[PDB]
Nucleic acid binder design. Sequence first.
RNA 1: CAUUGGAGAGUUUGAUCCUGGCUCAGGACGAACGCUGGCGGCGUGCUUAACACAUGCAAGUCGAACGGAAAGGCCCUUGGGGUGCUCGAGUGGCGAACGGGUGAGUAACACGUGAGUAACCUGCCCUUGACUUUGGGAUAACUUCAGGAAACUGGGGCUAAUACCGGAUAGGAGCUCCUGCUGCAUGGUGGGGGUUGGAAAGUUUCGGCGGUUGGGGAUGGACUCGCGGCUUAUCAGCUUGUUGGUGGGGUAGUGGCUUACCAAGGCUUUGACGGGUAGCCGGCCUGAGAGGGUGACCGGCCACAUUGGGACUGAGAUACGGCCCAGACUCCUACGGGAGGCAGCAGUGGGGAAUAUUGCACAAUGGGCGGAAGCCUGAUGCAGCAACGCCGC
RNA 2: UGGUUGAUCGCGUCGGAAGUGUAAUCUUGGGGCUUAACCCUGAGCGUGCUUUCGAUACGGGUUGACUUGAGGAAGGUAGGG
Lengths: 128, 200, 87, 90
Amino acid sequence: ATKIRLKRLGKIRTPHYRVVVMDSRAKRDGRAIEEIGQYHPKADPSVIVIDSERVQYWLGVGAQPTEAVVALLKRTGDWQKFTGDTSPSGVKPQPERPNKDDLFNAALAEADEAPREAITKKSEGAAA
Amino acid sequence: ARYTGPLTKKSRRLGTDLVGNDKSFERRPYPPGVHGRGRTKDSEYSLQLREKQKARYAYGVLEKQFRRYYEEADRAQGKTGDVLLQILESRLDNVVYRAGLAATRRQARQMVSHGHFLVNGKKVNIPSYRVSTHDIIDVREKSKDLPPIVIARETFETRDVPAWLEVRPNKGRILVHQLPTRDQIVIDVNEQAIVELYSK
Amino acid sequence: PNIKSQIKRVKTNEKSRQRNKAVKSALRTYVRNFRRAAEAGDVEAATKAARVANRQLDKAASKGVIHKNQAANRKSAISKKLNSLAA
Amino acid sequence: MSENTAERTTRRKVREGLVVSDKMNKTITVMVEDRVKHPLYGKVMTKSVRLKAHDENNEAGMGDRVRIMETRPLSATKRWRLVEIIEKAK
RNA sequence: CAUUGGAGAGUUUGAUCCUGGCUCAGGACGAACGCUGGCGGCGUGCUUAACACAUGCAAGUCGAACGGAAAGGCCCUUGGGGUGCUCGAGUGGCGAACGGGUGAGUAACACGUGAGUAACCUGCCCUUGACUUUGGGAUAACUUCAGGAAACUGGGGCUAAUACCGGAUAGGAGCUCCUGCUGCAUGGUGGGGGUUGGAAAGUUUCGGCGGUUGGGGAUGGACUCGCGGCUUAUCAGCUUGUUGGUGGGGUAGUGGCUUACCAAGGCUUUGACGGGUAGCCGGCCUGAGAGGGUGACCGGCCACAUUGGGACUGAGAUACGGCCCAGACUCCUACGGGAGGCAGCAGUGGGGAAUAUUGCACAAUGGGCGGAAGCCUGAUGCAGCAACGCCGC
RNA sequence: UGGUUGAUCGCGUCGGAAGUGUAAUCUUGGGGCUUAACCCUGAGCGUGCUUUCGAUACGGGUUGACUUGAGGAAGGUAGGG
Ligand SMILES: [Mg+2]
Ligand SMILES: [Mg+2]
Ligand SMILES: [Mg+2]
Ligand SMILES: [Mg+2]
Ligand SMILES: [Mg+2]
Ligand SMILES: [Mg+2]
Ligand SMILES: [Mg+2]
Ligand SMILES: [Mg+2]
Ligand SMILES: [Mg+2]
Ligand SMILES: [Mg+2]
Ligand SMILES: [Mg+2]
Ligand SMILES: [Mg+2]
Ligand SMILES: [Mg+2]
Ligand SMILES: [Mg+2]
Ligand SMILES: [Mg+2]
Ligand SMILES: [Mg+2]
Ligand SMILES: [Mg+2]
Ligand SMILES: [Mg+2]
Ligand SMILES: [Mg+2]
Ligand SMILES: [Mg+2]
Ligand SMILES: [Mg+2]
Ligand SMILES: [Mg+2]
Ligand SMILES: [Mg+2]
Ligand SMILES: [Mg+2]
Ligand SMILES: [Mg+2]
Ligand SMILES: [Mg+2]
Ligand SMILES: [Mg+2]
Ligand SMILES: [Mg+2]
Ligand SMILES: [Mg+2]
């Protein structure tokens, strides 16, 4: 049977899965009919990208998802669009956001307490 | 995996001051050893190799890693010597040295490998950490009162900080304005000679 | 065999072989009967034998002893021979 | 009336060649020539291959320039069929 | 309407220039050896004997198909209730053709690439149209008897099914006749008529889960074909089912695939036939490039599973942990006869310059069966070992 | 392998379009492992092939001219061919 499953990639102790479509008989990390998405669980709020159109097409043509892919489709909302069920459909929370340029401009100007806690550490060496 | 032997011997052999001044380099015009005062032929290889070794012993980088730097610079677009010197200057220990928080690059390597420094919030103990633009190197809060740190705080005014770095001495904070350019790295080797050497 | 599944399998393979061989031999006998009727040139006997043989071919195809394509091929041969005999 | 996806599209392979053997029944051996670059020296060579076609009615003779279309295996070696005769050199 | 890229040196002479070979500086490795040896990260680790293998494990699962009750578990004066969960052995379904291994064979439509099947088959899965009718006979288990050292074998009796077999009813299955539109020759396809025919299974803890048959989808496989990639002419002739034709047979399917008859073809100095070597490729190394070398890990295809041959079962078979026969081996034997195949994982012997632990876990991903809980998984995830490689300290 | 030239075909050749060239590798842009090796991700590459639509300068095919290459006729002619 055609399956929608996870193809493991990455390093030792660092898995990244490719949500792919292949038949059951094929080996886990092998040729796939189509690559649908990716799933990085090692990362914070695991990354879950699923191509909605393609996954809907494959579900409608009769590909059988593995339980993991069912969980991912529940989170992406595709498991509700196909086989309509009352599920929370918790579209992935974003894994927050850092920045660099704003912090650099903030500190370049920070000055003040930069050299200020700096002469405070001067007083510290005094204490040292 | 680190040169721990004397540096004045290497400076005398290479003919230039690898670091510091006003020292045993008063015996400069001749390399170390019994056969130092003799006249030399100096082939092209000799010359090239001298430039490469000067850069290596100046920056505290061994041959495999220096070679890796060379292929990275060669692949990069622009002048190969410019990119190579830019990489070597972007090394974190050299960044600490140039900012002036360390007396020498060896001291900078010591403190960096011992972890007295924070890179934009994250602790780094890798001397070869390539600092990127707009980065913020910080002294570890526990180690803001190191004796070498206070010596640097006493002496930095004499030291010249390059234009591509901003330093809050008393605060221990090195802001990286931009990744330096050849006109900003001090000219003390022949990067062109090094590039020619790595082609034979 | 080394696996009890495989021992079960050799037993069931023998059983299925007996069944399939019996059905195929019956098919061959029916087709031979039709061929001998056709060679004898009779019309009613050949017609009856052809009906019997085609029905048995379809029955075997349903039972899975032979493929439906094989059943269709043999039925087509029998029907064409009977048509030639009638003509 | 309303037939299925018509056209079939799927077109078969066509070769123009010269008949080099007509002395077996319902079969003509066609020599098809193609011009390709040499892989190393770049010269445009001439590659020739003998193709056995099926000529119902034996309508083609030696030296005739013919057109053949690929087919299903018609014998141990025949895989083409004559579709027209372009020049009857005779 | 610019480039990302190209280094030499020594040596023939008394000396010179040229030609010219030899040698060296570079990079690389599935490497080995010598000396030496701190750590971590990520990889890699029998290239030789496709040599012979002790031992454990590597494929099972389903009681919601069935008779049942040998264990555990509940209820009962120890047996007894099959009574409920559960459950060996047995029937039955599915899986066992995948995953994993190796590279011996193969110079070939095997592989790469691109097409064709109007010559194809496709279990489970999805979708849609019809249905799920009426009977019957056995048998394993069990029981008894006989034989055998064993492997086990043969009788008597007895028993249930979604096991097996009559029948009815069902198209797009056979044959045939009209007619519409058409292709690439054989033709494809729409509509109607005649005629002969082809199925099924029940079960449940009522929440389920299933059965048969048309048509599509998806998936996987099969065959055919153009082009492409070794060496040898100190191999020049090769072939007689061979090349083509017609009828029959066979097959999922075209076909000398097979057969009968007829014809005399087919291939070849543009290298047939023969010899040598070799799994092929994505890639890897090197190189300014063009090329040259290579085919470890990983991924795709192929081939093979003690050697040779054969079929069986099945939707599907080179059937690794299947069967049959033969050969060579090993083992058991009461001498009558039996049993077996690490190129699965770990491991041993052996060969070799040389390559590891008889480890842990199914927690993750993948697979098999089950309605499910779940069971199985030497796939895999991991750990051990070795400076073998890369990187960092 | 091919002198000059008309016409035509569009096989070579050239230019678009579609399909294909799995993934990994590789080049490169981002991101993650404290850095790196390594890993993930976007793109390129995949140097070809098939299908299809154009162009006709050149090569070639088909076809027709021209005489300068080539050969022949007539006359002249040298020679131990
Ligand atoms: Mg008989
Ligand atoms: Mg037939
Ligand atoms: Mg000489
Ligand atoms: Mg000399
Ligand atoms: Mg049981
Ligand atoms: Mg395999
Ligand atoms: Mg291999
Ligand atoms: Mg049945
Ligand atoms: Mg070939
Ligand atoms: Mg025939
Ligand atoms: Mg071999
Ligand atoms: Mg090769
Ligand atoms: Mg492999
Ligand atoms: Mg079968
Ligand atoms: Mg097996
Ligand atoms: Mg297998
Ligand atoms: Mg085995
Ligand atoms: Mg082993
Ligand atoms: Mg040895
Ligand atoms: Mg699982
Ligand atoms: Mg479960
Ligand atoms: Mg087990
Ligand atoms: Mg010309
Ligand atoms: Mg012209
Ligand atoms: Mg990539
Ligand atoms: Mg980073
Ligand atoms: Mg690719
Ligand atoms: Mg022309
Ligand atoms: Mg004359």
